[PDB]
């Protein structure tokens, strides 16, 4: 189990770690998060109490380095940094643990939620969507735009999700216009899976990462990407059976975890009604359809 120490907490802030969150008061003696499960990516995120503008946070994997948080009073945010001195870091953590100044990652043993949300999410793939190669961790916030959003303006601060556009020459073979537009299997299987993602695991990883950025940061372009990747599968008549079953599991846990009160902004009525009730896969998402109908029957 790994640890992300904090130098201090000089400003009042709600701190998230994965799907958990807790409030820290201004100048409270908080010095970090311990007992972080090894084996998953994680996200540590922030919303300041005095300016809920800009939720922001950091994706990281404790296997890739020793990371800590320190407030920067010039840039006005909690920054993640890497500590290269291993014995300094161990000594800092030990002292803070001895004084019990850390919150414990509060995982119930029965609980597979975080695994189920990050099953296909890899740090190496995150770092290609979020380009800042001098760090092993990746910053995301509420306002960052996607490459596609920018084509329709600072390229270094963009979310380089894979561009999906149903009315594009990439999606539509010359001479197969009607076929490819009404059945997106070509675009899904040849262009995206075989061509760009190489396999369904990478596709699902990007899908899951897009959902998590939408949920945790209210990142609108991430929400667009999550829905586009769902719609591309649902609108394909030919999808490997293992992908459909896995998608049903992925979406089920996403819908299960979504705050009930954020459904209006995080869920696109058109996409979900189309995917669950009109699409080729309308009958392939049993778990997802059942939780959506019991939890968000208004949307449908």
């Amino acid at each position: 189990m790994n640890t992300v120490p904090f130098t201090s907490a000089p400003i009042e802030v709600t701190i998230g770690i994965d799907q958990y969150s807790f409030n820290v008061k201004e100048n409270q003696p908080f010095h970090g998060i311990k007992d972080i499960p090894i084996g998953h990516v994680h996200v540590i995120h922030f919303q300041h109490a005095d300016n809920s503008s800009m939720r922001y946070g950091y994706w990281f994997d404790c296997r890739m380095g020793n990371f800590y948080i320190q407030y920067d009073p010039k840039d006005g945010l909690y920054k993640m940094m890497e500590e290269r001195d291993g014995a300094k870091f161990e000594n800092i953590v030990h002292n803070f643990k001895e004084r019990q100044m850390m919150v414990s990652y509060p995982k119930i043993d029965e609980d597979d939620t975080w695994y189920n949300l990050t099953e296909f999410v890899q740090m190496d793939k995150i770092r290609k969507i979020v380009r800042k190669d001098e760090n092993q961790f990746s910053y995301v916030d509420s306002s960052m735009t996607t490459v596609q959003e920018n084509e329709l303006s600072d390229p270094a601060h963009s979310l380089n999700y894979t561009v999906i556009n149903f009315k594009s020459r990439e999606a539509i073979r010359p001479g197969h216009e009607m076929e490819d537009f009404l059945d997106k299997s070509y675009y899904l299987n040849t262009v995206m899976l075989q061509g760009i993602f190489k396999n369904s695991s990478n596709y699902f990883g990007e899908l899951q990462f897009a959902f998590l950025n939408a949920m945790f940061f209210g990142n609108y372009g991430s929400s667009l990407q999550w829905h586009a990747m769902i719609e591309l599968i649902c609108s394909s008549a030919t999808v490997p059976k293992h992908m459909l079953d896995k998608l049903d599991e992925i979406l089920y846990y996403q819908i299960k975890t979504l705050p009930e009160q954020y459904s209006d902004i995080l869920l696109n009525e058109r996409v979900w009604n189309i995917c669950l009730y009109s699409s080729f896969q309308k009958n392939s998402l049993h778990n997802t359809e059942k939780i959506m109908e019991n939890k968000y029957p208004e949307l449908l």
Partner: protein
Amino acid sequence: GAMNSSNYAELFNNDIKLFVDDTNVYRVTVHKTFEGNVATKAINGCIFTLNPKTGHLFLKIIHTSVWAGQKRLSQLAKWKTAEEVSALVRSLPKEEQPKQIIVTRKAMLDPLEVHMLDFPNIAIRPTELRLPFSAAMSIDKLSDVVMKATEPQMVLFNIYDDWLDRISSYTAFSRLTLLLRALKTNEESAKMILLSDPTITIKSYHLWPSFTDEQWITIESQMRDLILTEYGRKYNVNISALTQTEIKDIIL
């Protein structure tokens, strides 16, 4: 975006543009089968692709063989229309290609956009105008060439005959849409109006009769009366009561 009464004069400006109407592409007669079920029989159709400024009509005749062994024909018809309009654009020299294509039915937007991906600078637009182009098959010479077709065929017409020698394109278009609206509302009476007088003929190379300027005013007045008359028969309204302002809103 969409084309309406606010931007109506844009139809007669110098940017090459075409209307596309797909109403008459997929045409059927519905009939009973020997077993007492219902079946359709397709008949030849056409795409109505019109330049509003010049009157040039690209009439692509849709022969019933294009439907053979196909499913979901009303859906296919939209994509076939889009395919044929795209092929027409590609067949035109660059200086003749449209800058805009206006579809009369919004269901044509996605099929045509997808077929025109190679032409990102050609705007595909809907219209809020209710245009009577479905009545094209009430023009005898157009109906004749469509029904007689034994294979796919493109036939070129000027739907304004020689009117542009004497009137603007705005006035020609207004005269065309009033003729077509009348033919659409009461075909029999409209054709009666257009041919009642045997001394006025249709030139071999024209679609409509050779009316003088004054005869056109009489004809256009008779067409407005027909559309008014039918409007009254429809809703059970005493049209005699109606004022001139009241008549102006109804005619379109």
